[PDB]
Design an enzyme around this catalytic site. Structure first.
Site, PDB file in Angstrom:
ATOM      1  N   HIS A  68       0.987  -1.185   0.009  1.00 18.23           N
ATOM      2  CA  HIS A  68      -0.027   0.017   0.103  1.00 18.23           C
ATOM      3  C   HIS A  68       0.862   1.224   0.088  1.00 18.23           C
ATOM      4  O   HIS A  68       0.764   2.165   0.898  1.00 18.23           O
ATOM      5  CB  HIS A  68      -0.921   0.022   1.223  1.00 18.23           C
ATOM      6  CG  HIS A  68      -1.948  -1.088   1.132  1.00 18.23           C
ATOM      7  ND1 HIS A  68      -2.126  -2.271   1.760  1.00 18.23           N
ATOM      8  CD2 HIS A  68      -3.220  -1.057   0.567  1.00 18.23           C
ATOM      9  CE1 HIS A  68      -3.173  -2.925   1.212  1.00 18.23           C
ATOM     10  NE2 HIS A  68      -3.837  -2.135   0.592  1.00 18.23           N
ATOM     11  N   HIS A  72       1.644   1.556  -5.600  1.00 20.79           N
ATOM     12  CA  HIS A  72       0.202   1.037  -5.858  1.00 20.79           C
ATOM     13  C   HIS A  72      -0.723   2.241  -5.884  1.00 20.79           C
ATOM     14  O   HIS A  72      -1.460   2.065  -7.070  1.00 20.79           O
ATOM     15  CB  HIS A  72      -0.129   0.403  -4.273  1.00 20.79           C
ATOM     16  CG  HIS A  72      -1.646   0.057  -4.271  1.00 20.79           C
ATOM     17  ND1 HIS A  72      -2.564  -0.608  -5.145  1.00 20.79           N
ATOM     18  CD2 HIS A  72      -2.590   1.011  -3.367  1.00 20.79           C
ATOM     19  CE1 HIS A  72      -3.807  -0.786  -4.728  1.00 20.79           C
ATOM     20  NE2 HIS A  72      -3.960   0.034  -3.876  1.00 20.79           N
ATOM     21  N   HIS A 106      -5.868   7.475  -2.920  1.00 22.29           N
ATOM     22  CA  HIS A 106      -6.969   6.485  -2.431  1.00 22.29           C
ATOM     23  C   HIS A 106      -6.450   5.828  -1.010  1.00 22.29           C
ATOM     24  O   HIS A 106      -7.258   5.293  -0.477  1.00 22.29           O
ATOM     25  CB  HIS A 106      -7.740   5.416  -3.309  1.00 22.29           C
ATOM     26  CG  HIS A 106      -6.797   4.211  -3.549  1.00 22.29           C
ATOM     27  ND1 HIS A 106      -5.928   4.063  -4.304  1.00 22.29           N
ATOM     28  CD2 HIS A 106      -6.908   2.928  -3.161  1.00 22.29           C
ATOM     29  CE1 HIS A 106      -5.183   2.975  -4.455  1.00 22.29           C
ATOM     30  NE2 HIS A 106      -6.252   2.350  -3.850  1.00 22.29           N
ATOM     31  N   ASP A 107      -5.244   5.654  -0.896  1.00 19.95           N
ATOM     32  CA  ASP A 107      -4.743   4.930   0.080  1.00 19.95           C
ATOM     33  C   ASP A 107      -3.424   5.687   0.902  1.00 19.95           C
ATOM     34  O   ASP A 107      -2.812   5.199   1.773  1.00 19.95           O
ATOM     35  CB  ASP A 107      -3.880   3.648  -0.256  1.00 19.95           C
ATOM     36  CG  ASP A 107      -4.785   2.385  -0.398  1.00 19.95           C
ATOM     37  OD1 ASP A 107      -5.800   2.248   0.398  1.00 19.95           O
ATOM     38  OD2 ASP A 107      -4.721   1.555  -1.352  1.00 19.95           O
ATOM     39  N   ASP A 217      -8.377  -0.572  -8.241  1.00 22.49           N
ATOM     40  CA  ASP A 217      -7.765  -1.043  -6.705  1.00 22.49           C
ATOM     41  C   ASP A 217      -7.274  -2.434  -7.072  1.00 22.49           C
ATOM     42  O   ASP A 217      -6.324  -2.815  -6.217  1.00 22.49           O
ATOM     43  CB  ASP A 217      -8.684  -1.003  -5.799  1.00 22.49           C
ATOM     44  CG  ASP A 217      -8.004  -0.853  -4.264  1.00 22.49           C
ATOM     45  OD1 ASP A 217      -6.618  -0.683  -4.471  1.00 22.49           O
ATOM     46  OD2 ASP A 217      -8.572  -0.938  -3.167  1.00 22.49           O
ATOM     47  N   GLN A 269      -5.689 -17.408  -3.229  1.00 21.50           N
ATOM     48  CA  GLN A 269      -6.041 -16.887  -4.499  1.00 21.50           C
ATOM     49  C   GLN A 269      -7.245 -17.273  -5.373  1.00 21.50           C
ATOM     50  O   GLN A 269      -8.178 -16.289  -5.746  1.00 21.50           O
ATOM     51  CB  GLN A 269      -4.599 -16.826  -5.463  1.00 21.50           C
ATOM     52  CG  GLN A 269      -3.582 -16.112  -4.630  1.00 21.50           C
ATOM     53  CD  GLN A 269      -3.878 -14.618  -4.602  1.00 21.50           C
ATOM     54  OE1 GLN A 269      -4.157 -13.989  -5.538  1.00 21.50           O
ATOM     55  NE2 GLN A 269      -4.085 -14.418  -3.523  1.00 21.50           N
TER      56      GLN A 269
HETATM   57  C1  LIG Z   1      -4.553 -10.394  -5.018  1.00 22.71           C
HETATM   58  N1  LIG Z   1      -5.374  -9.495  -4.154  1.00 22.71           N
HETATM   59  N2  LIG Z   1      -5.350  -8.130  -4.603  1.00 22.71           N
HETATM   60  C2  LIG Z   1      -5.986  -7.358  -3.424  1.00 22.71           C
HETATM   61  C3  LIG Z   1      -6.340  -8.225  -2.451  1.00 22.71           C
HETATM   62  C4  LIG Z   1      -6.883  -7.757  -1.291  1.00 22.71           C
HETATM   63  O1  LIG Z   1      -7.725  -8.454  -0.978  1.00 22.71           O
HETATM   64  N3  LIG Z   1      -6.532  -6.493  -0.488  1.00 22.71           N
HETATM   65  C5  LIG Z   1      -7.162  -5.834   0.668  1.00 22.71           C
HETATM   66  C6  LIG Z   1      -5.897  -5.292   0.633  1.00 22.71           C
HETATM   67  C7  LIG Z   1      -5.461  -5.576  -0.742  1.00 22.71           C
HETATM   68  C8  LIG Z   1      -5.776  -9.350  -2.850  1.00 22.71           C
HETATM   69  C9  LIG Z   1      -6.091 -10.926  -2.299  1.00 22.71           C
HETATM   70  O2  LIG Z   1      -5.078 -11.879  -2.408  1.00 22.71           O
HETATM   71  N4  LIG Z   1      -7.014 -10.920  -1.552  1.00 22.71           N
HETATM   72  C10 LIG Z   1      -7.371 -12.097  -0.604  1.00 22.71           C
HETATM   73  C11 LIG Z   1      -8.795 -11.938  -0.383  1.00 22.71           C
HETATM   74  C12 LIG Z   1      -9.476 -13.108   0.232  1.00 22.71           C
HETATM   75  C13 LIG Z   1      -8.981 -14.306   0.614  1.00 22.71           C
HETATM   76  C14 LIG Z   1      -7.435 -14.504   0.520  1.00 22.71           C
HETATM   77  C15 LIG Z   1      -6.664 -15.569   1.005  1.00 22.71           C
HETATM   78  N5  LIG Z   1      -5.426 -15.734   0.870  1.00 22.71           N
HETATM   79  C16 LIG Z   1      -5.111 -16.754   1.460  1.00 22.71           C
HETATM   80  C17 LIG Z   1      -3.958 -17.751   1.741  1.00 22.71           C
HETATM   81  C18 LIG Z   1      -3.848 -18.887   2.552  1.00 22.71           C
HETATM   82  C19 LIG Z   1      -4.859 -19.256   3.189  1.00 22.71           C
HETATM   83  C20 LIG Z   1      -6.169 -18.500   3.091  1.00 22.71           C
HETATM   84  C21 LIG Z   1      -6.188 -17.367   2.222  1.00 22.71           C
HETATM   85  O3  LIG Z   1      -7.419 -16.507   1.647  1.00 22.71           O
HETATM   86  C22 LIG Z   1      -6.871 -13.223  -0.218  1.00 22.71           C
HETATM   87 MG   LIG Z   2      -7.309   0.982   0.764  1.00 18.89          MG
HETATM   88 ZN   LIG Z   3      -5.648   0.252  -2.727  1.00 17.21          ZN
END
Ligand SMILES: Cn1ncc(C(=O)N2CCC2)c1C(=O)Nc1cccc(-c2nc3ccccc3o2)c1
Ligand SMILES: [Mg+2]
Ligand SMILES: [Zn+2]
Length: 313
Positions: A68, A72, A106-107, A217, A269
């Site tokens: 962040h 970004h 935005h961040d 985002d 993912q």
């Molecule tokens: C790629 N990308 N881009 C933005 C964001 C995001 O959400 N952001 C909020 C600040 C940016 C993400 C992201 O990956 N989100 C995400 C959402 C829900 C679950 C998981 C997840 N990973 C795991 C790994 C191991 C076990 C369980 C897991 O569950 C990951």
């Molecule tokens: Mg944000």
């Molecule tokens: Zn952001």
């Protein structure tokens, strides 16, 4: 006034594409952003001296966190630029001005922690802003920077135009709260399928700009696989630090944030692509057809994560 920003050839071409990566040269990001404002909004819409000083103050108020950060902000602004450029006639002069600035801001002053962690830590920002905690702060930081001497890039707007642009920016930044995205997309999905979606309805526009903000985002999931895979390292670097801080407060973090459950990342993912990314870019492509390359790139990256799971990488 006749001082046009020009990029080297490969950047001049690649910057028009949704999957452009702004590169590892920090000192070029400001010129990349001005270039995008000039082509998206006109060379007239901001005083260059004020824009440059605004951009450098915004940069100084992003922190050295793994995800962040300043890179970004500029990546997310570039994604919005691609959307506006591919949807020329759908957006007003003020929306084009407001949304690139919204994306850059935005961040602002993000510390690399979720709204959740602020609430469990009992952070002062959690007392001041009970929902969308970090996002009300980002907006609050944006107004602060706008009120610095020589930093009012909107100086030549009327009182009413000024209030309109700051309202576009406020709603745009609040919408980056992913907790708000789910209902916003569900409502847009319903409004699109029943045919009630009306871009002259201001509340309808608001929702469409919200989904764009979510789309920009999340735009790391729409890059070429090597950019997407290496951004995911930065995203999890923050997640795992937050997990560590959760354990320091005596709370088992969700597995997403537990660096012990690093093995489960590829499956995590998939969840996120299926639950958030694919629905987001699907609904966005239905409302704004020319954004389809974001959906296609997202699907390609889902398939790449499936290959990671099947031990093919
Ligand atoms: C790629 N990308 N881009 C933005 C964001 C995001 O959400 N952001 C909020 C600040 C940016 C993400 C992201 O990956 N989100 C995400 C959402 C829900 C679950 C998981 C997840 N990973 C795991 C790994 C191991 C076990 C369980 C897991 O569950 C990951
Ligand atoms: Mg944000
Ligand atoms: Zn952001």
């Amino acid at each position: 006034g006749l001082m046009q920003f020009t990029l080297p050839v490969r950047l001049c071409k690649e910057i028009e594409l949704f999957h452009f990566d702004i590169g590892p040269f920090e000192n070029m990001w400001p010129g990349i952003f001005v270039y995008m404002v000039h082509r998206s909004c006109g060379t007239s819409c901001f005083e260059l001296e004020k824009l440059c000083r605004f951009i450098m103050s915004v940069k100084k108020n992003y922190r050295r966190v793994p995800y962040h950060n300043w890179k970004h902000a500029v990546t997310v602004a570039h994604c919005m630029y691609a959307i506006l450029q591919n949807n020329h006639t759908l957006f007003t002069d003020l929306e084009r001005k407001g949304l690139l600035i919204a994306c850059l801001c935005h961040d602002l002053d993000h510390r690399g922690f979720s709204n959740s962690y602020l609430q469990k830590f009992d952070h002062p920002l959690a007392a001041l802003y009970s929902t969308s905690t970090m996002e009300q702060h980002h907006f609050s930081q944006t107004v602060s920077i706008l009120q610095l001497e020589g930093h009012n890039i909107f100086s030549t707007l009327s009182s009413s135009e000024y209030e309109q642009v700051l309202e576009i920016i406020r709603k745009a930044i609040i919408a980056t709260d992913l907790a708000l995205y789910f209902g916003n997309r569900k409502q847009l999905e319903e409004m699109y399928q029943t045919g009630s979606l009306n871009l002259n309805n201001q509340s309808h526009r608001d929702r469409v700009i919200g989904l764009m903000m979510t789309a920009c985002d999340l735009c790391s999931v729409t890059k070429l696989w090597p950019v997407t895979k290496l951004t995911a390292n930065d995203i999890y670097a923050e997640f795992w630090a937050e997990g560590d801080e959760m354990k320091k407060l005596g709370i088992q973090p969700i597995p997403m944030m537990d660096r012990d459950k690093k093995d489960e990342v590829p499956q995590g993912q998939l969840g996120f692509y299926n639950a958030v990314a694919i629905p987001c870019y699907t609904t966005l492509t239905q409302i704004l057809p020319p954004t389809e390359p974001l959906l296609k790139a997202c699907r390609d990256n889902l398939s790449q994560w499936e290959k990671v799971i099947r031990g093919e990488e």
